[PDB]
UniProtKB/Swiss-Prot annotation, chain A:
<protein>
    <recommendedName>
        <fullName>V-type ATP synthase beta chain</fullName>
    </recommendedName>
</protein>
<dbReference type="GO" id="GO:0042777">
    <property type="term" value="P:proton motive force-driven plasma membrane ATP synthesis"/>
</dbReference>
<keyword id="KW-0406">Ion transport</keyword>
<keyword id="KW-0066">ATP synthesis</keyword>
<keyword id="KW-0813">Transport</keyword>
Swiss-Prot record, chain C:
<dbReference type="GO" id="GO:0046933">
    <property type="term" value="F:proton-transporting ATP synthase activity, rotational mechanism"/>
</dbReference>
<keyword id="KW-0066">ATP synthesis</keyword>
<dbReference type="Pfam" id="PF01990">
    <property type="entry name" value="ATP-synt_F"/>
</dbReference>
<comment type="similarity">
    <text>Belongs to the V-ATPase F subunit family.</text>
</comment>
<comment type="function">
    <text>Produces ATP from ADP in the presence of a proton gradient across the membrane.</text>
</comment>
UniProtKB/Swiss-Prot annotation, chain D:
<dbReference type="GO" id="GO:0046961">
    <property type="term" value="F:proton-transporting ATPase activity, rotational mechanism"/>
</dbReference>
<dbReference type="InterPro" id="IPR002699">
    <property type="entry name" value="V_ATPase_D"/>
</dbReference>
<comment type="similarity">
    <text>Belongs to the V-ATPase D subunit family.</text>
</comment>
<keyword id="KW-0813">Transport</keyword>
<protein>
    <recommendedName>
        <fullName>V-type ATP synthase subunit D</fullName>
    </recommendedName>
</protein>
UniProtKB/Swiss-Prot annotation, chains E, F, H:
<comment type="function">
    <text>Produces ATP from ADP in the presence of a proton gradient across the membrane. The V-type alpha chain is a catalytic subunit.</text>
</comment>
<comment type="similarity">
    <text>Belongs to the ATPase alpha/beta chains family.</text>
</comment>
<protein>
    <recommendedName>
        <fullName>V-type ATP synthase alpha chain</fullName>
    </recommendedName>
</protein>
């Protein structure tokens, strides 16, 4: 919930860094709640109110004690409003769905009421089709300026990625962001685990006229270095030896500093320039002896920062 | 399997359980009642001063702890060997063995609660005095000291 | 046995009839120690701490499956007269063998 | 693996056996740690004794070199037969064999005790007892390192179990339980269908 | 069914409840009451209730409570080491944190519900006890950093003062807390 | 179906049968027959048949059988540790128990249904084999206590005599049994 | 899955089965018949003196015992490491892998029963003579001793 | 659903298809694409295509593929021993097998569909990469038998040439392969 609220507060178009520098096109956030309790509802209301984001938002809120059919109808209403705004008034709409787990539970209840054929864990056999009919309404239409972006937050039951809910959602959506319970145990916020995370549409949204020319290379190098650090530290618990090659100890330090500075950012609204700067500063590895998975010459332009913050 | 619906619901409704042990039975011990998994949820009310005896609950707790220690030491002595254990661990070994031989392996005998308490104190005497933490010093001074003769040597 | 230390220490150990080698640099000592291990007749090799602080880097190349010519570091006489760091040696040993620096 | 109720019970039994094995290995590790901490103190005492023996042997050698020529002590060193009467019995520790050194150290290697210089007997005896102290120290060190290796192996086993085996069995068990629940649910659905069809065919046929 | 928190009822309950007090029988086995497991138990009402604490009990209550939580977390994180090797063999500062964790478990987390006074503990009384414990910890850290022995700290007369602090009546608590703060300050000033 | 012993027919049979001889595929794959799962089998007629065993086989037959079952139970208990650390880490007594259990499984429980001799086994023949096995076990344990190596024990030719005992015809068995008992005594007196 | 209803019922009806092993197939062995789950119930009718040879059944039983022991020792090695084995366990491990590489892996060639029997005896010669407890003494005297290198160069 | 290959659609599909390219989620989580589980996959057309491979790629192409597959098999086998004993405590030949397998993976199996050159690979480019890797493997094996330590072998500059081989276009690949062959020969000749 905190991540959803923070994204709703901080998400902005950033049109200046785009090639087509202009005044901001209208941006709105449609927030849909499904099976939400009073406490989380109060949290969301206060979070939207204290920052002025409530002005550019339409909230569809469905409490836990509401009829079980309102949970079914809430995402439909939210997406209908978002589609209308985007494709008839050029609004750039970001849609946040509070908990699709509650929606799937309500759908299971309705299906069991109708006595249909069950699925993997009692869910109706058409759950994929219904979730697709919700999710697929996002996108951009040729010849129109508006856009619809969806961030469905859902809870993995027992952190099981093979559960029907996350499985079908991943089958329908383009990538996913995964929260790590261990990173939460270490006090890191947001506890986003980059190794099991993926964005299918990332590769064509970064580059020249979009973010910065070093974005893709930096992301690839960060993934390579963090994976190397994670695998070294996972082997150390097996070998049980802190004594190893000198280069491995560089990555362990890099991995720890990464998890403590890049991922652990609290409530900071880091700009993409600031995030890239922090990535570059964390890039304390060898300019050539390391950082070789992606061949880039932006090293001579950006490398050499000394972990300085603010 | 205790996960079966019948034992599960019985545990939901009843107050504790008494679990027979297959390995105790196949070792020739009768009755094959395993003390570690067995449990009475109302035991604390029906025993004590004026009901059975003052030392009943403490003696039972001490026997449970000592038997658990003896069992795990029997497991460990298989790999690390007899001599690698301290003296008190050998005492726990002997206590657990004599416990399974005399306390559990009762046979067709009808033991009054006094006889069972006396046998329990005889077994607890094998452990060193003062190691018996769960029992108050008064009960130890009053009862600790006897030796195993009621079941063997003088039935 | 054999002792690989400075020539003074090697001669002093020869006074006991024990094999001795005089080496002033680590690489020469390691090279001659490899030949001594290849000889393998002696059951123990003692090496100067100031010459090979970590003879473990050189023991494992030979005698891979066999450990009869066991070897330990010893303090050279030149610094033995000054004194030996017994407690730091034991702490670094327990770190090398356990890895928790648990002392006192 | 085959998802069946019997197989599920087998997996649960394997999980309980694995947990008991983890606990037993932890007890073994604690016992090995206690033995290791006794042996580290013993080896420290041996190290101090070796330090004193080395100090006096060095002082004795310096006295001999001061009061006797280098050529004379060189001849004394050459004349004495080498003390090669050494062996290492295969000591058995915690199921592992280690070489336990022992020295014969004959006193017949000495030549002319009163014919030697004034400080030759002192240096020879100091170096001899220094050598036997060194052998004792080597025994303590090899035993300590073997116990440390055994402890590291036990920790490897405990960590490997708790980190990859028990979670794996848990995942297998939960998968099997899900499969069995799915089969039970499908059976329930078919039972409902046949009961409904009995009601329908009995009602419509009258 | 068997303490398995994965069964459907537990999952459904924990998705809406504002707090979870994972009661454990191991602590009650060790005669620790109320036998609440600080690990695996959580509450979501601390944040919104912080202003109430600041206004009603003390301005510095949330910081002190977070200090308690951090010390408990450190003690829990050192449990594998203190289990592999005994606390006596453990390092001096680690031994200090273990002892202060024990002090917390015995004088703050403990509560005798059968007592005439300790069965109920006000928020101000708990604040005083926690403040005394943190004063002891900071003083002990300062003393250790300047070369005192751990057993010297383990036997100060202020320890039994903190122990008896929770058995004082509500009206006697303020003066007792003030005098115990003075006692701890003067005592640790006396130690070199 | 599929060997799933939790199948309703098998469960319904378990509740009315006086004996339950459970076969398992693990032994059948090894071609170890009759492939009876000892751990999963039971019989409720042991107590009622003992007077007949005493009258028609030997006065000590129930004691001998109980000792055999106890050794099998001990071997089953030790197998848990064997699958955890391997057979070498066990002590001499534990590995001796494991080896005696292996000997029992191989040359007392095994029975070739097609062999012209082993296919049928009279009660006194089984008694003789059990007596030989336990006499060997007692003498081997005594030797282990006095320092004889276990692998030294395993090389005794009288072990091969015990192994081949089950192939002896019924007519000539008593001479073989007496010879093997004398050989056991002589071997473990000479070899201590 | 051997517990699936189709193979389950077929096994309950037919006289044994020839079960293929995917592991042997991945090892390049053809035909990948792992003998442990396989079975022929009417084998005893077709083997023995005057039918194939006197030593056929005992040889088969001994081969099964040795292969099962080798598999168990493989599972043990998967835990305690190869160098921790005794000499007997190493011998059984070698018998197991040589078995899989020579007796099973025969390719598309045709072997007579005599060829297969002598190959089996060459494999059994890897084990100590006193440990072939399922084969009679006369058969061991008659056939034990030959080596694999004798069969082919 | 959930990667369960036992579901009816997958099983009914496997009964008719001639090739089975099984994907793995573990590889895709590590950005290791195509993420083909080279152990679980299979293809029934390998035998029938061999004459075409001989006549249109190279006469010895099937042997190259067989050797690469066997190296992958040995690497997969040794992975468990690495996980159990630790990579440090195994022989130099097995370390060479592990490193050659990792090189094979990350330089031949791995393929970026978005890179403008690595996306498409003709048969002869793959054949050249396989030849490079096997020549390096045999030279490194000879060097190991020559006493050369694997530590410097892993540091050879030819590894970068092999790793960047897959990013070379079709036009430049022949000269790159020829110079890579010459470098493979000459670098290990310089070991002497």
């Amino acid at each position: 919930n905190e991540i959803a609220a923070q994204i709703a507060r901080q998400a902005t178009v950033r049109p200046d860094l785009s090639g087509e520098g202009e005044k901001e096109e209208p941006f709105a956030v449609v927030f849909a709640a499904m099976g939400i309790t009073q406490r989380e509802l109060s949290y969301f209301i206060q979070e939207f109110e204290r920052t002025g984001a409530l002005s550019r938002s339409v909230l569809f809120l469905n409490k836990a004690d509401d009829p079980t059919i309102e949970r079914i109808l809430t995402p439909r209403m939210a997406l209908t409003v978002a589609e209308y705004l985007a494709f008839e008034h050029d609004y750039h709409v970001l849609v946040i769905l509070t908990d699709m787990t509650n929606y799937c539970e309500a759908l299971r209840e309705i299906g069991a009421a109708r006595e249909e054929i069950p699925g993997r864990r009692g869910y109706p056999g058409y759950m994929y089709t219904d979730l697709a009919t919700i999710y697929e309404r996002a996108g951009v239409v040729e010849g129109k300026k508006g856009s619809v972006t969806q961030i469905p937050i859902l809870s993995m039951p027992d952190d099981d990625r093979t559960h029907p809910i996350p499985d079908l959602t991943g089958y329908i959506t383009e990538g996913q962001i995964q929260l790590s319970r261990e990173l939460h145990r270490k006090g890191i916020y947001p506890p986003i685990d980059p190794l099991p995370s993926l964005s299918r549409l990332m590769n064509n949204g970064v580059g020249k006229g979009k973010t910065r020319e070093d974005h893709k290379q930096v992301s690839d190098q960060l993934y390579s270095a963090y994976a190397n650090g994670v695998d070294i530290r996972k082997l150390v618990a097996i070998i049980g030896e802190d004594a190893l090659t000198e280069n491995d100890r560089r990555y362990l330090q890099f991995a720890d500093a990464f998890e403590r500075f890049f991922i652990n950012q609290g409530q900071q609204n880091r700009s993409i320039e600031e995030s890239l700067q922090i990535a570059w500063a964390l890039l304390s590895m060898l300019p050539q002896g390391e950082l070789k998975r992606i061949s880039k010459d932006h090293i001579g332009k950006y490398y050499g920062q000394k972990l300085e913050e603010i | 399997d205790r996960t079966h619906p019948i034992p599960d619901l019985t545990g939901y409704i009843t107050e504790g359980q008494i679990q027979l042990s297959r390995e105790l039975h196949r070792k020739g011990i009768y009755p094959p009642i395993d003390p570690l998994p067995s449990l009475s949820r109302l035991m604390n009310n029906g025993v004590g001063k004026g009901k059975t005896r003052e030392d009943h609950k403490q003696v039972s707790d001490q026997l449970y702890s000592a038997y658990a220690n003896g069992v795990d030491i029997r497991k460990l002595v298989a790999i690390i060997g007899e001599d690698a254990l301290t003296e008190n661990d050998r005492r726990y070994l002997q206590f657990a063995d004599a416990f399974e031989r005399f306390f559990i392996n009762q046979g067709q005998q009808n033991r009054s609660i006094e006889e069972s308490l006396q046998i329990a104190w005889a077994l607890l005497s094998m452990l060193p005095q003062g190691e018996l933490k769960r029992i108050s010093k008064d009960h130890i001074g009053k009862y600790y000291g006897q030796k195993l003769e009621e079941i063997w040597g003088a039935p | 046995m054999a002792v690989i230390a400075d020539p003074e220490t090697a001669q002093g150990f020869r006074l006991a009839g024990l094999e001795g080698y005089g080496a002033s640099s680590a690489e020469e000592a390691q090279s001659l120690l490899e030949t001594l291990v290849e000889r393998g007749g002696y059951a123990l090799v003692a090496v100067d701490e100031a010459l090979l602080p970590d003879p473990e880097r050189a023991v494992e190349r030979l005698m891979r499956g066999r450990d009869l010519p066991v070897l330990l570091p010893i303090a050279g006489l030149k610094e033995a007269f000054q004194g030996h760091d017994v407690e730091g040696y034991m702490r670094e040993l327990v770190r090398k063998t356990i890895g928790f620096d648990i002392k006192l | 693996v085959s998802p069946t109720r019997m197989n599920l019970l087998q997996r649960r039994g394997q999980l309980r056996l694995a947990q008991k094995g983890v606990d037993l290995l932890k007890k073994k590790r604690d016992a090995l740690v206690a033995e290791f901490f006794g042996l580290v103190r013993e080896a420290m005492e041996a190290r101090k004794a070796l330090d004193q023996a080395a100090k006096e042997a060095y002082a004795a050698l310096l006295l001999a070199q001061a009061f006797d020529g280098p050529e004379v002590v060189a001849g004394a060193a050459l004349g004495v037969p080498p003390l090669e009467g050494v062996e290492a019995e295969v000591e058995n520790v915690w199921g592992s064999k280690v070489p336990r050194l022992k020295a014969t150290f004959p006193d017949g290697a000495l030549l002319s005790p009163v014919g030697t210089p004034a400080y030759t007997l002192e240096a020879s005896r100091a170096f001899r007892r220094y050598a036997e102290a060194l052998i004792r120290v080597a025994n303590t060190e090899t035993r300590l390192k073997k116990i440390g290796e055994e402890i590291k192996k036990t920790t490897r086993r405990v960590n490997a179990l708790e980190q990859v085996v028990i979670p794996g069995i848990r995942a297998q068990i939960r998968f099997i339980q899900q499969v069995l629940e799915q089969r039970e649910r499908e059976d329930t659905f078919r039972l409902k269908r046949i009961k409904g069809k009995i009601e329908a065919r009995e009602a419509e046929e009258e | 069914p068997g303490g398995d928190m994965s069964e459907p009822v537990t999952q459904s309950t924990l998705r809406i409840v504002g707090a979870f007090w994972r009661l454990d029988a191991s602590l009650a086995f060790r005669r620790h009451f109320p036998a609440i497991n600080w690990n695996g138990s959580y509450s979501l009402f601390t944040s919104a209730l912080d202003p109430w604490y600041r206004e009603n009990v003390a301005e510095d209550y949330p910081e002190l409570r977070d200090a308690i939580s951090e010390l408990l977390q450190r003690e829990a994180g050192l449990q594998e080491i203190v289990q592999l090797v005994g606390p006596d063999a453990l390092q001096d500062a680690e031994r200090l944190v273990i002892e202060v964790g024990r002090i917390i478990r015995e004088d703050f987390l403990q509560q005798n519900a059968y007592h005439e006074v300790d069965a109920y503990c006000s928020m101000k009384k708990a604040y005083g006890i926690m403040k005394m414990i943190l004063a002891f910890y900071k003083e002990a850290e300062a003393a250790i950093k300047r070369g005192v022995s751990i057993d010297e700290i383990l036997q100060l007369p202020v320890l039994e003062r903190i122990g008896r602090a929770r058995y004082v009546s509500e009206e006697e608590f303020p003066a007792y807390f003030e005098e115990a703060m003075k006692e701890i300050q003067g005592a640790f000033k006396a130690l070199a």
